[PDB]
From a paper:
The Pep2 structure shows the prototypical two-lobe architecture of phosphotransferase enzymes of PFAM family PF01636. The nucleotide-binding site resides in the N-terminal lobe, whereas maltose binds opposite to the nucleotide in a pocket of the C-terminal lobe.
Crystals of the M. tuberculosis complex failed to provide useful diffraction patterns, whereas diffraction data could be obtained with crystals of the orthologues from M. smegmatis, diffracting to a resolution of 3.6 Å. The core of the assembly is the previously reported TreS tetramer. In the hetero-octameric TreS:Pep2 complex, pairs of Pep2 monomers straddle across the β-sandwich domains of the TreS tetramer in a clamp-like fashion. We refer to this assembly as the 4 + 4 complex, which measures ∼175 Å in its long dimension, ∼125 Å across, and ∼90 Å in depth. The asymmetric unit (ASU) of the crystal lattice contains two copies of the TreS:Pep2 complex (complexes 1 and 2), which display differences in terms of subunit orientation and level of disorder. The footprint of a single Pep2 subunit covers surface areas belonging to two TreS protomers, including and extending beyond the C-terminal β-sandwich domain(s). The binding interface is dominated by van der Waals and hydrophobic contacts, corresponding to ∼70% of surface area buried in the interface per Pep2 monomer. Within the complex, the active sites of TreS and Pep2 are both open to solvent and do not face each other, suggesting that following release from TreS, maltose needs to diffuse through solvent on the way to the active site of Pep2. Second, the complex structure demonstrates that the ATP-binding site shares structural elements with the TreS:Pep2 interface. Given calculated masses of 272,000 Da for the TreS tetramer and 48,800 Da for the Msm Pep2 monomer, and considering that Msm Pep2 elutes predominantly as a monomeric species from the size-exclusion resin, the data strongly suggest that the sedimenting complex is the TreS tetramer binding two copies of Pep2, which is a “4 + 2” complex.
Numbering used by the authors:
A (entry chain L): 1 to 325, 329 to 439
B (entry chain D): 298 to 587
C (entry chain C): 9 to 513, 523 to 586
The structure:
């Protein structure tokens, strides 16, 4: 089952079973798309930990170009080497003409919205392929994205892109089409195609260059420097507020009380990998049980906002990767105060990764950089909240206690997620927990 | 003191060829463990006012006298700024080489603000005018009447104390003083420059001198201590591309030191860097993340 | 001018006409304009005031620099209460500059070496000393009584704003002779011409025809948005205003093919596109208008070290007609009103500018390129490099080629109008007259002074800014792509690097500009030119051929590259 070809499916980076200790891992499906193609939906069973099902559109014969052979040659089936079709131009063309038809094959049905797909253009594969997807760019007009780890749909990165653009909200790259199948019982969304924001730049990469400005040739104030991100942060505020207000219109709103017992379970489990976090825990729990038996407003939200999931194009900010992150729990509504917590959380990480990279970069007076970072971190958080509050009547800082809770929770999840993976990060969550 | 370094670096920029630098670096014998070379950016010995040369062992022997620029200053001490005709980009390049080449460097006073000289005062006094502190009377060097000064300050339109002084340059971080200051600040953050090994990388383009300084991981660490650093210098006045072979540091991330900017990671294929005329880069070769 | 009952008026046929250049209706799209004041450039009669004959003598320099067309600000007879933008006589050159004959001598001498000349021409208003206005006030029932906008109360057009709100209290001023109010958008001594009077329209069309008969190559029509005034509107960009401009274009196209009409309209790009005319006919108004907010954006883009303030206005600029061409220059203020263009709604950088300390310091004052960038040579090169490679025809301001400075204390507009610094000799080699006689003093500070900044000094070393600037124009003239090629922004992963491609269907050229003061790497996607060899233009150096993988270029702080994309063999 799988046989040696399996080895390739563990070299990925989008493969999560790197630590999971597997039992039998076997191919669950193989629809035939073309003579030399097959949409294989593999399934990986682990011992002690839930099953996870990946996909791979495998092609046979010869798999050019020469500049991908390392990152492409899956193995050798009798008697030509097999390779994943995201690296072949003749193959991705077909997989886009199938979305255009809009066609179906055995089980995998392809659908497209009432727009125009853009074939007959040269496609390459994008470099930063993520831990849940892979991406190829057709020309400068559209980008195709096959979900490397399919879990039983519906997929919010498709769902929430649709209603957002159907409303006309400008802050999402427009969705063109997608494709899914019905493996066993429930359905599985397999990938989407979307309008390419050619000429884009990540938020984290753009904040990193402003945080780079103050710090290098520093001791000159956070407002005086040219690099000042404050203006751009404010725009990003009303951008996130726009999508939230628009999402609440179609998704609707409900009232619910603060998840006291649920978020206590989070802080309790976080204390398993305990540091000085146990010393803050009573003061943190005092902040938690202060907001007990209080009602909030819950909308459909992004779920995983940080500067990385936000892109800047000419004439607008774009929100991407509605991942969001238990698919049932992912779709569940939540206080928008969690999303603004995510962005404000991300600002401190952008400023202090640099300060760690400026402790890099040692020794005598890193105290100056901290002074500038605290300046920068608190100023763009202000500028962001100001812009958010300028869009919708509601101000997030006006209901601060609710936000301060979710910021503290995002820090507890940040501590545990960092501490296990990277020990060097631990000062960032711990110090920021101390700050708040 | 490694005396013929500067004359070679000078002629190397003149020819727009790396080899006059490469040659003396290759022909320099190894020195003891305690020992350290001393290098500075001047063509003459202050004692005898003679430029070192060996008729047999120097292949550039006859070459110098034939160069019009070299010929003009025979037997006279000149500052860095006049030696390079006040070209700021060159002043930076020569300073960049001084700080990154093997051995301990010597800066001459006033070169940090790009002071000039007055040749007519004498072959050695030329570079011994007063330090130009402010654009005030006597360049802020003394309160005494101008006649009493041991030597007069520079007064020409180019290197004059009205236009070239410390006070003026302290403010903008773009000034030569502040630039020079920061370069010393960067150099002091990496031991590789001071006491690291020196391996010349070569390259296909003769106009670009690229090399690597390296210090070994003493009983363990991964800081700005136990670094490998990469220096790429362009001796040509026009923009130049160079394809370097950094396969040994495959997976490593070059980080430019003056801006802490991460460049694309080094691979198996030749690494391409493009420099402007008389430009240079200083990269910290940083490990990939375990 | 004169008067008998009508204000008499000289004939084009009494002066000669300079050598005509071969008829070419696209010269302005390929040209590089050089704005030079007549008073400032060179003085040949030792009066202390630059003159037409002096400018004639220095044409060889202009030719050597490599500029294609001279742009002269207004040189007509004037009381000069508003820098000569208050014209007293349209048919008479100001005495101190010379005679109309001396202008023809300049034209002929310039055309002989292929250099064209255009001039500022104020359309909206004349000086209150103009014979017309003196006849209008003194003889209200005469033939000029309706040449200006008169009224019995200062109530009309109340929606129109006061342009100079700190100097003028009203747009209506009371004339004591006529005992009536007269309209003026600008200063009280610059009364507005009444364009509702058909005779006025014909008079101004005859002014155009006069200088066109002498053989001038074109005009820059100043203050045109304020021509017509209508009730219930702000009296700006009214349909009848555009309708008159269409006549001027027709008169050019019918009588003098190959001449140009520039529109000084200090408005947001989305508004000024209307001044090119009906796009169905491919243009029937002005040939050129100025893209005013480019420089402020480029400036703020380098400040932020982010490409996007440049990208944004380039993306938000509407397409223009086929004949049409944008005009761009490296200044933040309009020389007429001393106002920086901005739109509260459509400019996203609206509040941003006032918050910047550098921008805030020079509000309302003309500054040269060198002082604007704090004399940073690397920046001066970058901004120049952008000016020459961005879409539209560029305008250089005199003295910027040698990096002259300014004297702000002389006045908000005079600051950039000091004498041209030719040598380090007395009066910077501008005049033989005693220093006291000079119309304005030369720069004397340690940085931009004529002892250290002049043409003579820079002619020798090819490393000088003059010689650098000269050569950049020499490179630009060798590739049509820069002038009239397409513009596609390449983007890239690094926000600090602005990369784009100009193309003609016969070069493709690639420009990479680094807005950050630190060295920056950029990975570009040039797959479309796979196999092509990039060749750097200033050195004719071949770079590695473009492949399928992203192409890596590394720039120094505020550096740039210009590559010719050359075919494989
Ligand atoms: Ca009017």
């Amino acid at each position: 089952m799988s046989v040696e070809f399996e080895d390739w499916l563990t070299q990925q980076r989008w493969y999560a079973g790197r630590n999971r200790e597997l039992v039998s891992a076997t191919t669950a499906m193989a629809v035939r798309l073309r003579d030399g193609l097959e949409l294989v939906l593999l399934q990986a069973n682990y011992a002690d930990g839930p099953d996870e099902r990946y996909q791979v559109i495998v092609a046979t014969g010869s798999g050019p170009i020469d500049e991908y052979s390392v990152v492409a040659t899956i193995g050798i089936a009798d008697g030509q080497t097999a390779y994943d079709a995201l690296y072949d131009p003749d193959a991705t063309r077909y997989l886009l003409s199938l979305i255009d038809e809009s066609a179906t094959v055995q089980n995998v049905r392809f659908v497209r919205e009432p727009d125009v797909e853009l074939p007959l253009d040269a496609p390459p594969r994008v470099f930063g392929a993520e831990q849940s997807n892979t991406s190829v760019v057709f020309g400068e007009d559209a980008i195709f994205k096959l979900f490397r780890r399919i879990t039983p749909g519906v997929h919010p990165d498709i769902e929430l892109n649709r209603v957002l653009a159907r409303a006309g909200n400008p802050h999402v790259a427009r969705l063109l089409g997608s494709f899914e199948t019905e493996w066993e019982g429930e359905p599985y969304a397999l990938g989407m195609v979307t309008e390419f924001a050619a000429n884009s730049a990540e938020g984290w990469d753009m904040a990193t260059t402003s945080t780079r400005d103050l710090f290098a040739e520093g001791d000159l104030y956070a407002e005086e420097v040219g690099g000042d991100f404050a203006g751009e942060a404010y725009r990003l505020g009303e951008a996130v507020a726009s999508v939230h207000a628009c999402l609440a219109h179609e998704l609707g709103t409900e009232e619910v009380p603060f998840p006291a017992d649920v978020m206590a379970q989070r802080l309790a489990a976080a204390v398993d990998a305990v540091p000085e976090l146990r010393e803050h825990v009573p003061q943190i729990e005092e902040r938690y049980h202060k907001l007990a038996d209080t009602t909030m407003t819950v909308q459909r939200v992004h779920g995983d906002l940080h500067l990385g999931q936000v892109l800047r194009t000419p004439k607008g900010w774009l929100l991407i990767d509605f991942e969001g992150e238990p698919l049932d729990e992912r779709r569940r509504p939540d206080t928008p105060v969690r999303d603004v917590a995510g962005i404000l959380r991300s600002f401190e990480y952008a400023a202090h990764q640099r300060l760690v990279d400026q402790a890099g970069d040692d020794d005598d007076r890193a105290r100056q950089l901290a002074a500038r970072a605290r300046e920068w971190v608190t100023r763009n958080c202000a500028s962001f909240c100001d812009g958010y509050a300028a869009e919708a009547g509601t101000d997030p800082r006006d209901s601060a206690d609710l936000l301060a809770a979710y910021e503290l929770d995002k820090a507890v999840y940040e501590a545990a997620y960092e501490a296990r993976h990277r020990p060097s990060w631990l000062p960032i969550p711990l110090g920021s927990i101390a700050r708040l | 003191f490694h005396f013929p370094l500067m004359p070679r670096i000078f002629m190397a920029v003149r020819r727009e060829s790396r080899f006059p630098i490469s040659e003396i670096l290759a022909q320099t014998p190894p020195i003891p463990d305690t020992a350290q070379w001393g290098i500075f950016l001047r063509n003459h010995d202050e004692l005898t006012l003679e430029m070192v040369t060996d008729e047999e062992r120097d292949y550039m022997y006859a070459e110098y006298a034939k160069d019009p620029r070299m010929k003009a200053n025979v037997g006279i001490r000149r500052r860095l700024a006049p030696l390079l005709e006040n070209d700021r980009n060159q002043i930076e390049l020569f300073t960049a080489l001084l700080l990154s080449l093997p051995g301990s460097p010597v800066l001459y006073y006033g070169d940090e603000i790009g002071m000039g000289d007055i040749i007519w005062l004498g072959d050695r006094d030329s570079v011994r005018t007063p330090m130009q502190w402010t654009p005030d009377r006597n360049a802020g060097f003394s309160k005494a009447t101008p006649g009493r000064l041991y030597l007069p300050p520079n007064q020409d339109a180019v290197y004059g104390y009205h236009s070239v002084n410390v006070e003026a340059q302290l403010d903008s971080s773009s000034s030569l003083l502040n630039w020079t200051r920061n370069m010393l600040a960067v150099r002091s953050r990496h031991d590789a420059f001071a006491v690291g090994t020196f391996r010349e990388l070569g390259g296909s383009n003769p106009s670009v001198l690229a090399y690597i300084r390296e210090v070994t991981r003493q009983q363990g660490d991964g800081g700005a201590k136990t670094d490998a650093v990469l220096c790429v210098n362009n001796l040509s006045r026009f923009p130049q591309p160079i394809e370097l072979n950094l396969q040994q540091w495959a997976g490593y991330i070059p980080v430019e030191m003056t801006g802490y900017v991460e460049f694309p990671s080094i691979g198996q294929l030749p690494y391409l860097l493009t420099l402007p005329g008389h430009g240079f880069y200083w990269f910290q070769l940083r490990e990939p993340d375990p | 001018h004169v008067e008998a009952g009508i204000v008499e008026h000289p004939n084009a046929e009494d002066f000669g006409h300079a050598r005509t250049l071969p008829t070419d209706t696209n010269w302005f799209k390929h040209a590089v304009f050089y704005e030079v004041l007549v008073r400032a450039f060179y003085d040949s009669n030792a009066d202390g005031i630059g003159d037409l004959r002096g400018l004639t003598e220095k044409l060889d320099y202009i030719k050597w620099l490599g500029v294609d067309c001279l742009w002269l600000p207004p040189f007509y007879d004037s009381p000069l209460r508003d820098g000569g933008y208050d014209i007293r006589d349209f048919y008479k050159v100001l005495p101190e500059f010379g005679t109309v004959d001396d202008f023809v001598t300049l034209l002929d001498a310039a055309h002989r070496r292929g250099i064209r000349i255009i001039t500022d021409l104020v359309m909206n208003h004349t000086s209150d000393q103009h014979e017309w206005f003196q006849e209008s006030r003194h003889n209200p029932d005469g033939p000029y009584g309706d040449f200006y906008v008169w009224s019995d109360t200062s109530d009309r057009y109340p929606d129109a704003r006061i342009i100079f709100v700190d100097t003028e209290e009203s747009n209506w001023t009371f004339d004591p002779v006529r005992r009536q109010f007269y309209w003026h958008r600008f200063f009280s001594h610059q009364p507005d011409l009444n364009y509702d009077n058909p005779a006025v329209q014909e008079a101004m069309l005859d002014v155009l025809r006069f200088w066109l008969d002498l053989g001038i190559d074109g005009f820059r029509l100043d203050a045109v948005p304020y021509l017509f005034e209508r009730e219930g509107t702000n009296c700006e960009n009214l349909p009848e205003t555009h309708a008159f401009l269409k006549r001027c274009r027709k008169a050019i196209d019918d009588e003098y093919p190959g001449r140009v009409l520039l529109a000084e309209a200090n408005q947001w790009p989305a508004d000024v596109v209307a001044y090119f005319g009906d796009p169905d006919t491919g243009g029937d108004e002005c040939h050129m208008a100025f893209h005013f907010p480019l420089m402020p954006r480029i400036f703020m883009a380098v400040r932020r070290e982010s490409r996007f303030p440049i990208s944004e206005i380039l993306a938000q600029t509407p397409p223009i007609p086929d004949t049409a061409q944008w005009g761009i220059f490296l200044r933040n203020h309009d020389e007429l009103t001393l106002e920086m263009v901005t739109d509260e709604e459509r400019d996203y950088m609206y509040a941003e500018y006032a918050k910047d300390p550098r921008m805030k310091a020079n509000v309302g004052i003309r500054r040269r390129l060198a002082p604007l960038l704090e004399n940073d040579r690397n920046q001066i090169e970058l901004f120049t490099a952008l000016l020459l490679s961005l879409p539209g025809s560029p305008v250089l301001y005199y003295g910027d080629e040698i990096g002259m400075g300014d004297i702000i204390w002389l006045g908000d507009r005079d600051s950039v109008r000091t004498p041209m610094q030719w040598t380090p000799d007395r009066n910077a080699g501008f005049s033989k007259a005693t220093p006291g006689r000079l119309y304005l003093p030369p720069n004397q500070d340690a940085v931009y002074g004529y002892h250290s900044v002049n043409v003579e000094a820079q002619l020798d070393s090819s490393s000088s800014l003059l010689n650098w600037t000269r050569n950049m124009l020499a490179v630009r003239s060798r590739h049509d792509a820069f002038a009239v090629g397409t513009f596609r922004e390449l983007g890239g992963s690094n926000p600090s690097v602005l990369a784009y491609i100009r193309e003609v269907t016969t070069d493709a050229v690639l420009c990479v500009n680094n807005l950050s003061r630190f060295p920056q790497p950029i990975e570009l996607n040039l797959q479309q030119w796979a196999g092509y060899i990039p060749v750097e233009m200033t050195g004719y150096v071949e770079f590695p051929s473009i492949g399928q993988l992203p192409y890596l270029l590394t720039l120094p702080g505020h550096g740039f590259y210009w590559f010719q994309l050359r075919e494989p063999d």
